Design a protein around this ligand. Structure first.
Ligand SMILES: *[C@@H]1O[C@H](CO)[C@@H](O[C@@H]2O[C@H](CO)[C@@H](O[C@@H]3O[C@H](CO[C@@H]4O[C@H](CO)[C@@H](O)[C@H](O)[C@@H]4O)[C@@H](O)[C@H](O[C@H]4O[C@H](CO)[C@@H](O)[C@H](O)[C@@H]4O)[C@@H]3O)[C@H](O)[C@H]2NC(C)=O)[C@H](O)[C@H]1NC(C)=O
Ligand SMILES: *[C@@H]1O[C@H](CO)[C@@H](O[C@@H]2O[C@H](CO)[C@@H](O[C@@H]3O[C@H](CO)[C@@H](O)[C@H](O[C@H]4O[C@H](CO)[C@@H](O)[C@H](O)[C@@H]4O)[C@@H]3O)[C@H](O)[C@H]2NC(C)=O)[C@H](O)[C@H]1NC(C)=O
Ligand SMILES: *[C@@H]1O[C@H](CO)[C@@H](O[C@@H]2O[C@H](CO)[C@@H](O[C@H]3O[C@H](CO)[C@@H](O)[C@H](O)[C@@H]3O)[C@H](O)[C@H]2NC(C)=O)[C@H](O)[C@H]1NC(C)=O
Ligand SMILES: O=c1ccn([C@H]2O[C@H](CO)[C@H]3OP(=O)(O)O[C@@H]32)c(=O)[nH]1
Ligand SMILES: *[C@@H]1O[C@H](CO)[C@@H](O)[C@H](O)[C@H]1NC(C)=O
Ligand SMILES: *[C@@H]1O[C@H](CO)[C@@H](O)[C@H](O)[C@H]1NC(C)=O
Length: 161
């Protein structure tokens, strides 16, 4: 029921993706999204110390030189507090999810946002998730590149029929 989304390195994409390519990082966690989105005053103010414990997860913000902890705090505020109640279980999950992402191509990896590269003739996956979803910026008929890994379809498993 929870969507796990992450960023993948792409020099062709200004922002987090360019920074990941430079830093030799393949997959950086974006968030874990339950059905319920949090509204109102959070239960706990996520400190940088707490948020730095999610090892390997880069910030999508230029303001922190794509390090910590803007994206991280945003995630706890919008998706974390009202669903996990405590920061400790949330931190451990986010970190274990990022640990697994650092290992390599996940069991379930589906393109979310693409950036078609005319030179290589590939759909360079900028963001991916553990469930198939309507694509964005993807050219139909072209193969996919998930941080260097070439896949025929938008997912690393069969969806259809
Ligand atoms: C997918 O997403 C859901 C959230 O959307 C995750 O579910 C949460 O999981 C965490 C644990 O990983 C749970 O946190 C613990 O909640 C306890 C309170 O729960 C009450 O019972 C039900 C659960 O059936 C809730 O729905 C109620 O609202 C209640 O409030 C809470 O006591 C507990 O704290 C205890 O443990 C921690 C660490 O061990 C201590 O720090 C703490 O002080 C205390 O002893 C945790 O906060 C949470 O209940 C879940 N919430 C819901 C709504 O289901 C899934 O596990 C995610 N799964 C995947 C696979 O991504
Ligand atoms: C990864 O992406 C980065 C960012 O997009 C990328 O750098 C960009 O590409 C090029 C290649 O170095 C840079 O382009 C140069 O930019 C200056 C103006 O800023 C122009 O004057 C340059 O023109 C000369 O260079 C050519 C070299 O082949 C000549 O043939 C040409 O006629 C000129 O004399 C040139 O276009 C560019 O500035 C950056 N862009 C940004 C937005 O930073 C880099 O190539 C990629 N790295 C890897 C490892 O793939
Ligand atoms: C991160 O990746 C892990 C691997 O997918 C997974 O952790 C869980 O723990 C064990 C490792 O000890 C996996 O392997 C085990 O498989 C059998 C299955 O019958 C277990 O009985 C054994 O203990 C064995 O070593 C588990 O399969 C695995 N659990 C699940 C539910 O898939 C985590 O799920 C990953 N965490 C995140 C947050 O993505
Ligand atoms: O984890 C993240 C967080 C944010 N962005 C966003 O970064 C730029 C910000 O302009 C956004 O444009 P966009 O396609 O609407 O969403 C992009 C990511 O790509 N990954
Ligand atoms: C997060 O995972 C790393 C491995 O990537 C581990 O060494 C680290 O201390 C973890 N943080 C915790 C458990 O808070
Ligand atoms: C990342 O994928 C590259 C291909 O871009 C692979 O060769 C490498 O071992 C991985 N490096 C990481 C996860 O740091």
């Amino acid at each position: 029921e929870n969507i796990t989304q992450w960023n993948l390195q792409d020099n062709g994409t200004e922002g987090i993706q360019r920074a990941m390519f430079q830093r030799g990082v393949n997959r950086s966690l974006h968030g874990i999204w339950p059905e319920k989105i949090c509204t109102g005053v959070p239960s706990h103010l996520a400190t940088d110390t707490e948020l730095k414990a999610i090892h390997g997860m880069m910030d999508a913000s230029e303001k922190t030189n794509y390090t910590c902890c803007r994206l991280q705090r945003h995630e706890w505020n919008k998706h974390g507090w009202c669903n996990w109640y405590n920061i400790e279980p949330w931190i451990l999950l986010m970190n274990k999810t990022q640990a697994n992402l650092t290992e390599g191509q996940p069991l379930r990896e589906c393109a979310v946002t693409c950036r078609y590269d005319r030179d290589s003739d590939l759909n360079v996956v900028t963001q991916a998730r553990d469930s198939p979803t309507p694509l964005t910026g993807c050219k139909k008929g072209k193969n996919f590149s998930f941080a260097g890994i070439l896949v025929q379809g938008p997912c690393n498993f069969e969806i259809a029929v």
